[PDB]
């Protein structure tokens, strides 16, 4: 996150760091005692070298670490250049006992609409400057949902955003998520309800003509339920 603020430690206990060889790769959200939901493109890796670490604030600390038993990419995930259905479910090799620093975030009803103008936030350990370095501490940025049609404008995302995609803007031009922040959760409203998982932007993270976009969670709720084994 560029221009973001350090979270009160452990105020977002549903946060996961997906890590390759002990180095932060993507955010994730714990949505069941045994499953973290993250971005599908984050899994273009040697699974053997990946871990999920829960209950963190400083990246430089143990936190509670899990091996991954399975990585279930949405059945219709389409990689870049499409980047359609960009979600993956990761099964922990253990079961979270909910505490004060580690607990799942509830899924939204499947009938949730992320309307334009909705006030949200997101958190991550992603880069704090263009071409810089990971944040050392968990951070947050407030974001508002933009109108998708306007976001699909030729000078913006060029007709390329689908109805399952949530288009985002910070309050100022120099605030944006950046490399490391994808997979992280977009939570919206007074109830800080799960509404999105961050996906992509442009190569320049603060590019105002290429605003950050998250995958909407609601349309995927029934697949998440099937996969994690409820209904």
């Amino acid at each position: 996150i560029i221009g973001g603020r350090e979270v009160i430690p452990h105020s977002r206990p549903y946060m996961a760091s997906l890590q390759r060889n002990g180095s932060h790769l993507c955010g994730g959200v714990l949505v069941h005692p045994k499953w973290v939901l993250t971005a599908a493109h984050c899994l273009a890796q040697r699974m053997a070298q990946l871990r999920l670490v829960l209950g963190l604030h400083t990246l430089d600390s143990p936190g509670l670490t899990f091996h991954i038993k399975a990585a279930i990419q949405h059945p219709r995930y389409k990689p870049v250049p499409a980047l359609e259905n960009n979600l993956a479910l990761l099964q922990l090799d253990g079961k979270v006992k909910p505490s004060r620093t580690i607990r799942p975030l509830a899924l939204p009803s499947k009938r949730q609409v992320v309307a334009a103008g909705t006030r949200c936030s997101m958190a991550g350990w992603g880069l704090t400057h263009q071409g810089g370095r990971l944040s050392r501490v968990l951070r947050e940025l407030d974001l508002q949902v933009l109108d998708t049609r306007m976001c699909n404008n030729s000078r913006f995302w060029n007709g390329s955003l689908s109805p399952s995609m949530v288009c985002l803007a910070a309050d100022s031009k120099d605030q944006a998520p950046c490399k490391g922040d994808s997979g992280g959760p977009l939570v919206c409203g007074k109830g800080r309800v799960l509404a999105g998982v961050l996906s992509f932007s442009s190569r320049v993270c603060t590019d105002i003509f290429k605003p950050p976009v998250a995958t909407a969670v609601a349309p995927y709720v029934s697949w998440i339920r099937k996969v994690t084994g409820r209904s």
Binding site: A39, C42, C178, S182, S199, F200, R203
Partner: peptide, 7 residues
């Protein structure tokens, strides 16, 4: 064209 995962 230019989607870049926050990878």
């Amino acid at each position: 064209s230019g989607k870049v995962p926050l990878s």
